[PDB]
Amino acid sequence: TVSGIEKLNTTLGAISGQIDNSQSLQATTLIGHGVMVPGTTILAGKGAEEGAVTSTTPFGVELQQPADKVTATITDKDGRVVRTLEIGELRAGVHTFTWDGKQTDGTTVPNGSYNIAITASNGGTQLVAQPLQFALVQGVTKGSNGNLLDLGTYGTTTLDEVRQII
Amino acid sequence: VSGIEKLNTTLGAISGQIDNSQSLQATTLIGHGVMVPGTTILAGKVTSTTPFGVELQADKVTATITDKDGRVVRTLEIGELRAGVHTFTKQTDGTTVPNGSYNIAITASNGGTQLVAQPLQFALVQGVTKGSNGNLLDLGTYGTTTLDEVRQII
Amino acid sequence: AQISTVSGIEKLNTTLGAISGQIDNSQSLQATTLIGHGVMVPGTTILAGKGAEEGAVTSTTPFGVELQQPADKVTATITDKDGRVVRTLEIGELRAGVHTFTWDGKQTDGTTVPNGSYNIAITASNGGTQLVAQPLQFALVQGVLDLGTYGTTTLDEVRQII
Amino acid sequence: LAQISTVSGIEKLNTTLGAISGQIDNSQSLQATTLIGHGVMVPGTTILAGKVTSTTPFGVELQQPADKVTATITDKDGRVVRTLEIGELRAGVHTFTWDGKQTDGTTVPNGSYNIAITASNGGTQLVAQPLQFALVQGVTKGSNGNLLDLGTYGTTTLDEVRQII
Amino acid sequence: NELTTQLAQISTVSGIEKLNTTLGAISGQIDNSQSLQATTLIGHGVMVPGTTILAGKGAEEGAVTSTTPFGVELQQPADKVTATITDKDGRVVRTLEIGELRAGVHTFTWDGKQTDGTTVPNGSYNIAITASNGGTQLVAQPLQFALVQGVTKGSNGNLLDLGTYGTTTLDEVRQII
Numbered sequence: 140t141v142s143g144i145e146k147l148n149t150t151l152g153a154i155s156g157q158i159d160n161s162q163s164l165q166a167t168t169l170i171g172h173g174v175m176v177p178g179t180t181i182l183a184g185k186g187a188e189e190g191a192v193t194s195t196t197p198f199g200v201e202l203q204q205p206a207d208k209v210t211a212t213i214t215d216k217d218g219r220v221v222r223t224l225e226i227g228e229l230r231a232g233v234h235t236f237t238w239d240g241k242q243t244d245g246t247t248v249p250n251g252s253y254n255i256a257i258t259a260s261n262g263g264t265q266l267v268a269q270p271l272q273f274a275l276v277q278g279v280t281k282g283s284n285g286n287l288l289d290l291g292t293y294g295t296t297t298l299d300e301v302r303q304i305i
Numbered sequence: 306v307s308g309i310e311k312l313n314t315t316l317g318a319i320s321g322q323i324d325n326s327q328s329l330q331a332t333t334l335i336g337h338g339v340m341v342p343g344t345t346i347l348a349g350k351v352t353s354t355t356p357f358g359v360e361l362q363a364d365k366v367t368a369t370i371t372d373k374d375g376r377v378v379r380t381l382e383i384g385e386l387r388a389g390v391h392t393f394t395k396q397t398d399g400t401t402v403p404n405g406s407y408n409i410a411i412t413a414s415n416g417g418t419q420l421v422a423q424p425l426q427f428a429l430v431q432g433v434t435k436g437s438n439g440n441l442l443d444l445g446t447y448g449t450t451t452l453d454e455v456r457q458i459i
Numbered sequence: 460a461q462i463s464t465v466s467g468i469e470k471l472n473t474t475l476g477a478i479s480g481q482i483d484n485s486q487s488l489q490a491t492t493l494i495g496h497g498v499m500v501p502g503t504t505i506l507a508g509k510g511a512e513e514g515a516v517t518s519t520t521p522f523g524v525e526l527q528q529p530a531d532k533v534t535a536t537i538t539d540k541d542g543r544v545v546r547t548l549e550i551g552e553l554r555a556g557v558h559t560f561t562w563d564g565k566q567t568d569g570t571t572v573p574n575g576s577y578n579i580a581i582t583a584s585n586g587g588t589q590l591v592a593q594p595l596q597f598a599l600v601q602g603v604l605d606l607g608t609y610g611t612t613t614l615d616e617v618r619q620i621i
Numbered sequence: 622l623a624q625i626s627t628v629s630g631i632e633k634l635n636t637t638l639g640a641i642s643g644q645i646d647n648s649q650s651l652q653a654t655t656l657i658g659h660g661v662m663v664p665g666t667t668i669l670a671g672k673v674t675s676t677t678p679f680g681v682e683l684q685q686p687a688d689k690v691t692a693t694i695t696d697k698d699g700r701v702v703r704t705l706e707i708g709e710l711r712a713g714v715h716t717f718t719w720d721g722k723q724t725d726g727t728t729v730p731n732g733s734y735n736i737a738i739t740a741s742n743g744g745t746q747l748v749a750q751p752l753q754f755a756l757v758q759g760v761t762k763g764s765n766g767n768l769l770d771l772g773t774y775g776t777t778t779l780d781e782v783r784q785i786i
Numbered sequence: 787n788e789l790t791t792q793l794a795q796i797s798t799v800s801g802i803e804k805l806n807t808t809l810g811a812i813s814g815q816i817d818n819s820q821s822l823q824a825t826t827l828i829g830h831g832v833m834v835p836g837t838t839i840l841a842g843k844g845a846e847e848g849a850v851t852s853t854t855p856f857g858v859e860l861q862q863p864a865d866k867v868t869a870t871i872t873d874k875d876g877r878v879v880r881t882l883e884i885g886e887l888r889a890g891v892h893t894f895t896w897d898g899k900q901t902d903g904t905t906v907p908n909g910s911y912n913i914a915i916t917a918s919n920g921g922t923q924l925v926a927q928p929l930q931f932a933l934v935q936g937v938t939k940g941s942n943g944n945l946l947d948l949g950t951y952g953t954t955t956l957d958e959v960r961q962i963i
Binding site: 479482483486489490492493496555556557614615618619620621 | 637641643644647648650651652653654655758759760761762763764770
């Protein structure tokens with residue numbers, strides 16, 4: 140019985156290694172889908188068609204505690220603020236939103252890259268708010284500790300650092 | 306002694322991997338819809354209804370639907386149900402209900418003796434989120450839910 | 460040291476139970492692919508219809524049958540809602556297992572049948588010895604399995620996916 | 622007391638575990654549902670042609686590598702329409718596609734053709750198993766395990782599938 | 787009683803020797819299931835050890851030349867990484883200064899235009915990568931694009947059929963696109 144337990148013990152370790160190989164293939168399903176990862180970048184563009192409507196790569200925020208007032212400041216490449224957004228109250232966890240792509244005056248913003256800054260508080264006490272940016276998965280790469288995701292421009296990321304899959 | 310405690314710790318890691326592998330699988334759900342505990346019913350577009358349900362571990366089952374204002378709009382008896390999960394999809398006078406949100410109340414009995422009945426609600430998937438005790442599903446407006454709490458997928 | 464290990468094992472058993480439970484719901488997730496397609500399930504119902512289009516072709520929901528033993532004579536009787544026989548079918552010889560077929564949508568007189576629902580009865584024998592023959596019905600999948608009109612079904616009771 | 626319980630207990634774990642194996646096959650079917658649009662490579666010699674004319678791909682399995690590999694294509698009448706020098710192959714499974722044109726360079730008519738494959742290493746002939754293309758149209762249930770439905774060609778197990786396309 | 791005890795003993799032994807045989811089916815069902823999820827790779831393309839880079843235009847007019855992506859795997863990080871592209875004749879059509887790289891796998895895509903600024907003809911090209919860290923050259927494994935075209939069964943384990951490039955195991959793949 141003393142000998143038996145250790146042999147069974149070694150086997151469950153070997154199975155876990157086997158379990159990992161499915162995980163690599165499983166990650167390939169994410170390819171083509173966009174994810175939410177730490178960042179502030181928001182893109183903006185127009186289709187080649189005419190009558191094309193401007194859209195924006197979605198953004199988000201992660202919270203450890205809930206908040207009652209959440210504002211999102213959007214700046215352009217020059218650092219100039221083009222739009223401020225009042226979002227609402229939010230409970231702890233991950234939340235995702237989509238900017239209409241229009242600035243404060245109501246006009247459509249030019250095609251380009253923008254950045255968000257998010258302040259969150261509950262009854263006037265400031266909270267740690269982690270901004271999230273849209274990133275398209277482009278492939279699955281092999282790391283030294285585990286499989287990685289290729290988000291292209293945004294670079295590479297592990298799976299545990301993905302906040303949400305879209 | 307070391308082997309048994311080591312088996313617990315290693316099998317625990319196994320438990321962690323399997324659910325997150327399922328999390329990657331949950332991306333398949335994105336675009337569809339699920340059945341989870343709840344009572345809310347919305348309506349938008351002949352008018353159709355976001356599905357509802359009930360789970361049993363009864364011979365007489367009546368279901369009362371209330372409005373946002375609290376008024377009761379319709380009850381329907383179709384019949385009895387065996388254990389497991391059952392899901393289904395106009396005002397009492399026969400008129401169409403206004404566009405909005407509604408709530409369900411479900412009564413279930415066996416020989417006039419009531420049973421524990423959990424009402425079930427539709428939720429459209431928009432993404433997959435990471436929780437604190439384990440990975441979560443994003444039902445959007447309705448929020449998040451685990452997979453064990455999913456009763457049926459639509 | 461023993462009593463510690465005893466508590467540990469009970470903890471291990473509970474965790475191994477949780478693993479078994481998790482596996483079942485993931486299998487459910489795999490089933491989600493099935494909604495867009497369609498399956499063959501136990502039943503006798505066969506539908507028939509015509510489009511509003513011109514050149515519209517009558518179509519029939521395909522049917523099937525499963526056998527435990529091989530047979531040399533297999534006949535399929537199609538009855539209507541009233542019980543009246545609309546068509547009899549000689550299929551052929553069949554080895555044991557599952558086989559699926561499609562009715563041309565024409566009755567015995569050679570005319571096309573009106574749009575509606577029909578029922579099949581299948582008799583199969585090998586050398587004048589009668590055999591157990593289980594009839595099968597076509598079903599469009601609508602959720603996870605929930606087939607709508609046909610109601611609900613397990614996956615193990617699903618014979619083939621198309 | 623405990624003995625007969627453990628007897629049942631071992632058997633009780635089995636009945637539930639038997640269901641797990643049963644569940645896995647239904648999982649395989651779902652993956653196989655993805656397989657239907659594509660097709661697999663199974664033992665055979667059949668090659669089709671239709672309308673530029675194209676041909677259902679063919680293949681060959683080898684236990685040992687070879688220095689000489691030729692493939693002779695015949696029509697329905699048995700007449701040889703094309704011979705092919707493909708190259709060399711290491712042991713295992715290899716898949717190819719015929720241009721659908723005979724030796725003179727003209728395209729063969731739409732129909733069915735057959736392949737014959739000879740393989741040798743240093744003038745020593747090798748066992749060569751020809752492979753044919755078959756489109757999956759559904760997934761069937763056997764008595765010992767799940768089966769695949771190839772339509773015209775019938776049914777096949779998964780272990781005898783040499784390659785998936 | 788002695789007889790009946792031995793009866794229940796042999797049944798446990800047969801039952802245990804029945805469980806591992808049944809589990810063996812499961813462990814074998816897993817491998818077949820893995821081949822089925824490997825089918826998802828069939829549409830996709832991978833990055834494997836190699837130096838080949840392809841270029842081409844579509845049948846359309848006004849079509850722009852594109853190239854299959856290339857890459858490099860490193861064991862140590864590098865501050866200097868150069869990539870030389872030559873054609874079949876051997877002349878250098880383009881040299882690429884990639885820059886700093888951390889250890890691991892990195893993939894890029896050539897614009898398909900040579901040094902003078904013109905577009906390279908449709909055909910096959912070769913990549914040559916040298917990586918060094920502070921004057922000390924490193925081992926760099928060059929990677930080429932290869933489209934998966936099917937899943938094959940060898941004699942020891944399932945393989946990926948990459949067509950022209952041939953076959954490969956899964957662990958020999960550095961990236962899946």
